[PDB]
Amino acid sequence: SGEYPTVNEIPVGEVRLYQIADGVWSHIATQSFDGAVYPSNGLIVRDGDELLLIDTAWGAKNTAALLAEIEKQIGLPVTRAVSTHFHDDRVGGVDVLRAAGVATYASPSTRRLAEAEGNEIPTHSLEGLSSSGDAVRFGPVELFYPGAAHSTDNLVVYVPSANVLYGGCAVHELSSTSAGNVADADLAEWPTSVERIQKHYPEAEVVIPGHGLPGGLDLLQHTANVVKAHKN
Numbered sequence: 001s002g003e004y005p006t007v008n009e010i011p012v013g014e015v016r017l018y019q020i021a022d023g024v025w026s027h028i029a030t031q032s033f034d035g036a037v038y039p040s041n042g043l044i045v046r047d048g049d050e051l052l053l054i055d056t057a058w059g060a061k062n063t064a065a066l067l068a069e070i071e072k073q074i075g076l077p078v079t080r081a082v083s084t085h086f087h088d089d090r091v092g093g094v095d096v097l098r099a100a101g102v103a104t105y106a107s108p109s110t111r112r113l114a115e116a117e118g119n120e121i122p123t124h125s126l127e128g129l130s131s132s133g134d135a136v137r138f139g140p141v142e143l144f145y146p147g148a149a150h151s152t153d154n155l156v157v158y159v160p161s162a163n164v165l166y167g168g169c170a171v172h173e174l175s176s177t178s179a180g181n182v183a184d185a186d187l188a189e190w191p192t193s194v195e196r197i198q199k200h201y202p203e204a205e206v207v208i209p210g211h212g213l214p215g216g217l218d219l220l221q222h223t224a225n226v227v228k229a230h231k232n
């Protein structure tokens with residue numbers, strides 16, 4: 001009924017959208033992993049009379065449900081998708097997208113990691129993002145590689161028309177008490193990577209984490225704080 005939808009509010013298999021700004025939505029789905037249920041976010045950005053998708057909904061069936069929810073709520077075709085790192089909450093569902101007419105993209109680093117680990121593999125490589133601080137334009141967004149954080153390949157996405165910063169899993173929500181799933185993380189480099197995001201996007205108005213509630217710029221400092229303390 002208007003609040004940001006939360007883990008116990010979304011059965012696994014169902015997807016919700018949340019309007020962030022004009023032409024910008026997040027998508028929220030839930031999935032089971034190792035016997036616990038988690039929410040996760042992605043982004044939808046209006047690209048004229050088409051849509052750009054950022055990240056899958058964490059699984060094939062969730063991603064099919066995402067497409068159906070977009071058709072119901074927005075009614076414009078998803079033509080391209082970008083996955084912001086190689087994990088299943090970002091690429092699981094790429095095969096569904098690829099069979100629904102969507103062109104799927106990720107950095108070569110993400111594609112390699114996804115292939116090596118047995119995750120679904122986006123079709124197209126995004127060059128120009130291999131060094132920290134690199135940025136490229138992709139439709140209505142800018143893609144930015146901040147350096148290693150949650151993963152070595154993680155990308156962030158900025159929507160300049162709306163000053164929306166989608167941090168993906170490199171950014172944690174304010175209620176976070178831990179650095180999340182750190183299996184593939186670089187806790188030593190993570191604060192430096194967050195500082196790069198802070199420096200590059202000082203005018204961000206909304207910051208969206210990979211999991212949990214959006215907020216403002218404080219999510220970046222909070223993330224740095226919880227990762228440093230986790231490492232400690």
Ligand SMILES: C[C@@H](c1cccc2c(-c3cnn(CCN)c3)c(C(=O)O)[nH]c12)N1C[C@]2(C[C@@H](CN)C2)OC1=O
Binds near residue numbers: 038150173183184212
């Ligand atoms: C799919 C994703 C994943 C699964 C379950 C939970 C999370 C969380 C999470 C847990 N808690 N929270 C709340 C913290 N604010 C978020 C985050 C996040 O942190 O992005 N990703 C998660 N995988 C699995 C993997 C283990 C590796 C294979 N050995 C690959 O690593 C990784 O990320």
Ligand SMILES: [Zn+2]
Binds near residue numbers: 150151169
């Ligand atoms: Zn991850």
Ligand SMILES: [Zn+2]
Binds near residue numbers: 087169
């Ligand atoms: Zn994640």
